[PDB]
Design an enzyme around this catalytic site. Sequence first.
Site, PDB file in Angstrom:
ATOM      1  N   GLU A   1     -11.650   0.250  -2.955  1.00 19.16           N
ATOM      2  CA  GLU A   1     -10.775   0.792  -1.910  1.00 19.16           C
ATOM      3  C   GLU A   1      -9.617   1.560  -2.565  1.00 19.16           C
ATOM      4  O   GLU A   1      -9.598   1.733  -3.783  1.00 19.16           O
ATOM      5  CB  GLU A   1     -10.260  -0.335  -0.984  1.00 19.16           C
TER       6      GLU A   1
ATOM      7  N   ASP B   1       0.822  -1.201   0.000  1.00 20.03           N
ATOM      8  CA  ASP B   1       0.000   0.000   0.000  1.00 20.03           C
ATOM      9  C   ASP B   1       0.862   1.259   0.000  1.00 20.03           C
ATOM     10  O   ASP B   1       0.732   2.105   0.895  1.00 20.03           O
ATOM     11  CB  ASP B   1      -0.963   0.004   1.196  1.00 20.03           C
TER      12      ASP B   1
END
Length: 330
Positions: free
Chosen positions: A229, A18
């Site tokens: 997301e 991420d």
Amino acid sequence: VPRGSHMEPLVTHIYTADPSAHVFDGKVYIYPSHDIDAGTPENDMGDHFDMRDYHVLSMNSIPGEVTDHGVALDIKDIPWAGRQLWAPDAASKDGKYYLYFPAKDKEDIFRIGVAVSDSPAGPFKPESEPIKGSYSIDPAVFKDDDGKYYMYFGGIWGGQLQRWTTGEYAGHDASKTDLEQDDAPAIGPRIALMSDDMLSFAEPVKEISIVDEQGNPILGGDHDRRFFEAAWMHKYNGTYYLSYSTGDTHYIVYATGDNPYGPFTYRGVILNPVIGWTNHHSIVEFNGKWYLFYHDSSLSGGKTHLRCIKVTELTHNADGTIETISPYIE
Ligand SMILES: O[C@@H]1[C@@H](O)[C@H](O[C@@H]2CO[C@@H](O)[C@H](O)[C@H]2O)OC[C@H]1O
Ligand SMILES: O[C@@H]1[C@@H](O)[C@H](O[C@@H]2CO[C@@H](O)[C@H](O)[C@H]2O)OC[C@H]1O
Ligand SMILES: O[C@@H]1[C@@H](O)[C@H](O[C@@H]2CO[C@@H](O)[C@H](O)[C@H]2O)OC[C@H]1O
Ligand code: NA
Ligand code: NA
């Protein structure tokens, strides 16, 4: 040793995911999740992502040596948080640095908190409570050219965004996925202008509309294109680019608009599916070149929850379109 030349893992001594990349003090700082092999049960709510701290990474060049600055924040020191330190982001204002992070509170509800430092490398001191009016996951704090800062946020399924339609949490027996109405507009990510002091929202949270090329809302059943997301905002040639992960279809896609709040018109794919279920990215300009930071599960031999960050060059065309990257071709 220098890393980032041929889509190889940027670090191998820890698992990383991420990647949120920023240019602070002429260096690239990366704010990733720190994956650990917790061995926790695997399920569609993501209990197998059981991360507990953040390490800030930095690079002076790409390719370049990657510095691991140690533990910048540990969940044991966040008073309000019980578990699951998920994807963070950082912002810089007036010589202070702010780390924004999603975690589960003691009622098992995802909230977003802030932690503060005098350095982009941390360490950061968390505020004792999460941001008032925050919920769900995956903050991206974007500084616009006019000096206004906006938090983009949200994630469906395990990210719980689908449980926040009324301004109250729908509860642990509420939808585990989405609105469960595939012919209605899909759930959109959230945005709020940040307060001057960067610790709170300056307005009621808004939902972003994402539409197709004809102006029709992207529908709940359109899993190839609808928001899941990993919202990210960047600007190029006066256009606002909302990019995000589609989750169960494993794409990073993008949509363009003329202001921070949208609506954003779906354009195409940024990054095709990688090794491992998740796909998460950031887009950043450094020394006049644009870069896509992303991750995969290559280093762990394909374990979805044990990832490694990577980087590659991203190409905008002058008409505003972005060339699609396929991760394993060159
Ligand atoms: O109902 C259960 C919850 O209590 C549990 O929530 C966790 C409780 O401990 C806290 O420290 C954590 O933040 C929180 O997530 O989650 C599972 C659920 O069955
Ligand atoms: O919140 C998200 C979870 O809902 C997501 O869960 C995945 C759903 O599909 C399953 O096949 C996968 O095994 C599982 O990881 O994971 C990502 C998380 O952000
Ligand atoms: O330029 C073309 C667009 O006009 C096209 O728009 C689609 C039209 O049908 C709708 O049901 C779709 O949601 C919408 O995307 O997209 C493809 C492009 O070639
Ligand atoms: Na992000
Ligand atoms: Na494309």
